[PDB]
Design a protein around this ligand. Sequence first.
Ligand code: FAD
Ligand code: URC
Ligand code: FES
Ligand code: FES
Lengths: 99, 98, 481, 49, 464, 98, 99
Amino acid sequence: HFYLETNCTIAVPKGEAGEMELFVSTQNTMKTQSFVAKMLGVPDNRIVVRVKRMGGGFGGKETRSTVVSTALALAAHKTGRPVRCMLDRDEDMLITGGR
Amino acid sequence: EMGQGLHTKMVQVASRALKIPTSKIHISETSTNTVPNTSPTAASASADLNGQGVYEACQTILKRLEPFKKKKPTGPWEAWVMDAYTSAVSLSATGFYK
Amino acid sequence: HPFLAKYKVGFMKTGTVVALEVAHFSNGGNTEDLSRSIMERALFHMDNAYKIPNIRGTGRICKTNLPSNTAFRGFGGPQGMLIAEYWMSEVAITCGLPAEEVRRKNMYKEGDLTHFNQKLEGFTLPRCWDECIASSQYLARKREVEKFNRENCWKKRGLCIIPTKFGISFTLPFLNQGGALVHVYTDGSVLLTHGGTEMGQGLHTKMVQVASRALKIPTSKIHISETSTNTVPNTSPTAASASADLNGQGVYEACQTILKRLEPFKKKKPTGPWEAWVMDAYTSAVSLSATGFYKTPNLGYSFETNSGNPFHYFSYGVACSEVEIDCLTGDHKNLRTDIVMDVGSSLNPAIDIGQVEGAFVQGLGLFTMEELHYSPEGSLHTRGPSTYKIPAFGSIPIEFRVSLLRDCPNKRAIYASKAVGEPPLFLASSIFFAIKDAIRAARAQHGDNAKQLFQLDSPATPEKIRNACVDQFTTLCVTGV
Amino acid sequence: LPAIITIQDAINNNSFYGSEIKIEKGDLKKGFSEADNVVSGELYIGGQE
Amino acid sequence: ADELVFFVNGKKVVEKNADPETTLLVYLRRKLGLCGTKLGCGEGGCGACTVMISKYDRLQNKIVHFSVNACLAPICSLHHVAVTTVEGIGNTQKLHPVQERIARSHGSQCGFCTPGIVMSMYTLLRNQPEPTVEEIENAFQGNLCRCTGYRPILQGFRTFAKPSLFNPEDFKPLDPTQEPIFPPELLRLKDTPQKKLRFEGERVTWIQASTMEELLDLKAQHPDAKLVVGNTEIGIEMKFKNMLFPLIVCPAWIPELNSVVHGPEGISFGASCPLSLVESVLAEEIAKLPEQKTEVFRGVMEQLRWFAGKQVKSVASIGGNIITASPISDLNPVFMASGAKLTLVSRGTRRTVRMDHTFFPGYRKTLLRPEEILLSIEIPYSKEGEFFSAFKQASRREADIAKVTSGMRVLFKPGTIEVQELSLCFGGMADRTISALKTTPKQLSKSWNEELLQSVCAGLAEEL
Amino acid sequence: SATLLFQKDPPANVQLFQEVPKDQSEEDMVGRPLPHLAANMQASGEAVYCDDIPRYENELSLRLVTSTRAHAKITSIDTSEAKKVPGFVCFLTAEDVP
Amino acid sequence: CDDIPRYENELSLRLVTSTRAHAKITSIDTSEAKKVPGFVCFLTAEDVPNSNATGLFNDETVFAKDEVTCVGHIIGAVVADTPEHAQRAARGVKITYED
Ligand SMILES: Cc1cc2nc3c(=O)[nH]c(=O)nc-3n(C[C@H](O)[C@H](O)[C@H](O)COP(=O)(O)OP(=O)(O)OC[C@H]3O[C@@H](n4cnc5c(N)ncnc54)[C@H](O)[C@@H]3O)c2cc1C
Ligand SMILES: O=c1[nH]c(=O)c2[nH]c(=O)[nH]c2[nH]1
Ligand code: FES
Ligand code: FES
């Protein structure tokens, strides 16, 4: 896809009731939400996914964005601390696949 | 928004629907806690689907403003709106399309 | 807002009040803020619980070089009502009749019009009064008080039973509106929000409760995270005790809309679970998101014609309080308080009992403990707990009894409930007038006429209590004799 | 500059927010002239933080 | 050394550049991210910031536990102690019974005061696992709540003593064995002699002095060095009166400032002894000795009943109250009326003064020289025919500043009702603690009768 | 009673309220004493109040400056000492209001 | 997304990925990863609260469990203070494979 902005998630744990807020470069807030919820074992109403804008998607951020989102959601849940991951280009190109 | 100008288009749509300038309409972000259960931005479809949603949301507002528009057909948008507020009429609406 | 009142009441030898004139003045400080609506609410409650055929109240709001005063739980009602009860106390004393009989015979009945011409329907105050009389064992304890006072020269007890009426709805009618937004995600979980804010009154708790009944799902499947201008716009402040009333309706309407949209899927699988209806709705492309709104109907008072209903309904309650003052120091104990409060069919009796106690203890502070001091050039001196003495753990009535009135559904609010935040605060006036009762008795103990109308400003602090207990020590210290 | 602090300073200087608010019903002069007893007085109620 | 080392919720904290101006509340919240402990006033009156301190008391070879106001505790005072915050006793995954019961009994509304009240109650239970209803209410003298009206907090906690809103039978029981261990590292470290510490901040240097020699050398060299013990006065002067002491010395570690010596005439407390220790010592003596001997002790105990709450009395020193010399000190009138013996030392001088009117010449002053410190105060046994009362009236009974506060003593000629001595002392009636020196002398030799009552009242009316 | 040291009987509290209809569903909580939903979190210190929200690494602190006079003209303002404080950024006044 | 300012307490995550197309994970040695200043933790399948099953057809792992099935299969995630430290730590996760 070579979207010029690679995949990126910030997950912010809220400390109450399993509440978490994610800032994600994704075309799919819903699946991001669902996948993080299930991975944590909390209902969807606890998870908020926010997308301001992406520096390219082209279909590459329709689903494969969630492999970063989930890892990061977990780190945030575990540590009680905000966690962030933006993929390097080599990482993004290897992990996320293509046409 | 991923560079395809979706928000621009939806602002264009809402402006025509409400008959106000685009200057008075803003879109800040996309969020699971404002619109739930959204399909991905994909299949070239997102302006068609969201455009209709936006349209319908605007139609609901217009329907609520109608009586204040009849009473003051020329007096500006700001006046209708403040009138609806002080008459305790909702100025929030969802819209949806399949 | 501090208040100054000038009053003149006329009454019969029976204690029946036939004329009342009160001029009110508030210290508004250096911006207008809510000062005028506060003074309106004061004027609306200058009757407290009493029918007065000939009556005139005036209010003027002073513009001063002080920080701007604002809303405080009660919003001018407590100031209005203390004045009412102050002259009422003086009517009973002047008449030589018991306070509780003088108050009862001057009380409004069902169907009466207020001085502002609103009809009192569903008037439960007489029931609050009779239940509080019996449950507090008021007449028996009046004699026990009388006895203690014969047996003790330098400690005195006082017992007073006080009613209240409190009008529910913002005085500015269009503020009586609220909104909700509800999403059902595809796992069946619900995210709810409304215009109300949570400040300890358990509003979110009550709205989850409301939504859970409306949708017929457990409360565990519904969550509220926050209040936000970009989920519900144009919200009234969380104030006027009305937020459960307004948002409850809002939430209920949002929920009804979601139900209507699920009813085809329900009909197809009436046993099948909630989760299935939701996923069925989603995969049939039905919207699982809705707004809800409510405005309180038929409000709007005119000062010019003295017509229109400012309130949707009234709250009613009654408190009996007993105190024991130390006549030599001004210290006192709050021995026992008995409260009967109409909260309609409570949304949550734990939370409502919480609000009665919370409201009452703030009022207890207002009328007995809490005092702000300024330099003559207008600088607040009282700027922390070291100098500003709110009620402590040790301050509250030793025996503290609260009852919610039974079998009093209130049709016109959410699930027959009533608002609760503000109405109970004034009932702490019962401690103020119990103190006044004890002071009288201390004064009688030093050969003071007992139709003597000595001054007791609020708050009734140790200073004011001690100085009013005139004796050989106050006489020496002031006079030199 | 001259300060206005107390309610009485304000009455003295005609320093109010807007005009008198009033409610009156019935006939005061009659009520008072027909009563057995008349009791007048003043009350101050302090503010609250 | 210069490293500050303490424990928080069982976890070692090593701070390499402690700033004397940093409070424990700010360190917890902003350095450690533990925001359970709240800021409600910064003054010590609200308790929203209440946490527990645990430490090894070297003088008693035991582990002690007390509450403090974190808003007023300098981190520089906390070398080798162990702090417990609300996060330390439980969470929503495993609530401590204190936590469970306040929650389930509807004792949390806005919730802002709840951690504070939870830590006061928790601290009570670590000291007394079976408290009386009375001890429970007293745990909260330094805790304010604006929402609940207090009833449900007390009702819920009453379960720990000796159609319904909650079910106490469903409360998990408390097993005191399951509380966090005292950090073994702190028992390992109590085998090392305390060394002098120096901390340098932006504006303030703090010396934690290990010995009397170090303290007295410092005061001799640098008499402007400001003693800090509980910080319950100096904390207010800094935060609120914007006063700045660029050099502080804290002597709380020094044994001779912490000692409790029984003597023929009374009980000597080191100047840095906390009021809670004065309380615990005097309570024992009152309970065992004859009434005849404990009239002044009971005086002091009465004044301490209404002296803030547990948080302040755990760190507030007896010496601190005396030297502060507030016009409204509740203890100085009692010390004055009983003529308590004070010992004042510098490097190379030791003297004693009975507290009288000369001890306090002017506003907030004593007769201490710049280079002197107060070492000890002896609270006397009362003699046959010696009687004492203490009084305090404020705006609130509990945790208030006195309007008028007093100590009063009479000694009678033995076997008579004839006055030998009479001492009537007052706070809140001048810019210093005063004695009614004009009224009391003319009562000597008079009998304790109506005529004496009248003479004194008229005397006081004119004199004060 | 004048000589008595202060003493209080122990508390005696009674809370009366109406039971819901017995035909009401156990899942329907309206009229039931359900604890405040945040009570546990509020006992545990996990509930987040505004100042509990972590700071952004680039976050600044503000302190209001207020009048020490009831009524006066502002003749002049001197920020020269303020500017010497480490980490000082700016003093906002009326003229900064956009 | 990455232009959003970091919270003072924010942590960085770095994915650790399979270097074999198909192989059992014999062992994972984090011993070098822990020596890296800033290291917080290494997340694996065991740290997942609820479900390790994700993806649109539920046939994907959040983290590799027992076998890796592509070069770039996500095995775990390092958490550290900074991205530099997360990357270095990630290099100190030695994985043993059996093809
Ligand atoms: C919330 C609150 C409530 C309070 N309530 C009361 C009350 O009811 N009654 C009352 O009287 N007080 C009260 N106080 C005042 C304060 O608690 C006491 O004065 C306390 O005893 C001071 O002790 P400290 O160790 O904290 O002194 P610090 O604040 O450490 O020091 C106080 C002063 O004493 C000096 N000092 C300390 N030790 C020595 C020594 N050995 N030699 C010479 N100088 C020394 C210091 O240099 C300083 O000038 C209250 C304070 C707070 C914060
Ligand atoms: O009638 C009211 N209007 C308000 O704006 C308000 N605010 C409040 O606290 N109580 C009230 N009451
Ligand atoms: S914040 Fe109020 S006592 Fe510490
Ligand atoms: S519940 Fe709000 S201050 Fe205690």
